[PDB]
Design a protein around this ligand. Structure first.
Ligand code: ROC
Ligand code: ROC
Ligand code: CL
Ligand code: CL
Lengths: 99, 99
């Protein structure tokens, strides 16, 4: 699809077997969710942004379906106010900005 | 242009009289700079991000040039780690996210 930006660009994704919504974010390096439970091991990571840093769990090679496509990549989990799909995932579905 | 997302999507912008660079950020509501100086009075404003809330200066009706499109918008000046072009400016140049 072609998405205008008059509203925040959320999309449906499936991760860990659950349907979630997340913000398509061209400014973010990373992909992060609040309250999803993933299997397998994780490693601690800190991510920074406006206002400071977030302590998260990093899970590697996680399948995400976004809203229709299969991506495998890194997923962060921590107490974020919003789920975000960052460039690490969006490059794998060929997302582009156009103007 | 049509911009892929393998690198961070920075663009050249002229804000006030000054050439700067900033991140095209579909996950940001606002346009925020740290390294510009704008004249005159400003209004206090608070913005949120992943880590908490920051105090910024709001300057109204500021000219912004990006990719040859000259627009007039609200520019915030605050302790952001990265200059960001948010959806408020991107909608004015007709930017879309596509996949
Ligand atoms: C933006 C922030 C998330 C705070 N990250 C950083 O500031 C990291 C932190 C790292 C650990 C501590 C020591 C410094 C390194 C490198 N910095 C990068 C920082 O010092 C450096 C500033 C700079 C820019 C241009 C020319 C010279 C210097 N940025 C850079 O070199 C490149 C610029 C680019 N176009 O990619 N940017 C980044 O490295 C950077 C990293 C994460 C980001 C996440 C989201 C959005 C933008 C992000 N930009
Ligand atoms: C989410 C995460 C992966 C941690 N990445 C980032 O946060 C990186 C960090 C980078 C270095 C510092 C400068 C910003 C860049 C780009 N950001 C992405 C960037 O897109 C980021 C994503 C985001 C949105 C909403 C809430 C939190 C976080 N947007 C923002 O930080 C913008 C800033 C603003 N006020 O315009 N925030 C918002 O637009 C915004 C909207 C609604 C909100 C509701 C509650 C609380 C905070 C809310 N913030
Ligand atoms: Cl959700
Ligand atoms: Cl990020």
């Amino acid at each position: 699809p072609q998405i205008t930006l008059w509203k925040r660009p959320f999309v449906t994704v499936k991760v860990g077997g659950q349907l979630k919504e997340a913000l398509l974010d061209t400014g973010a390096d990373n992909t992060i969710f609040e309250d999803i439970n993933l299997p397998g091991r994780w490693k601690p990571k800190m991510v920074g942004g406006i206002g400071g840093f977030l302590k998260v769990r990093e899970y590697d090679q996680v399948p995400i379906e976004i809203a229709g496509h299969k991506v495998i990549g890194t997923v962060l989990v921590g107490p974020t106010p919003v789920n975000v799909i960052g460039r690490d995932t969006m490059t794998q579905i060929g997302a582009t900005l156009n103007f």
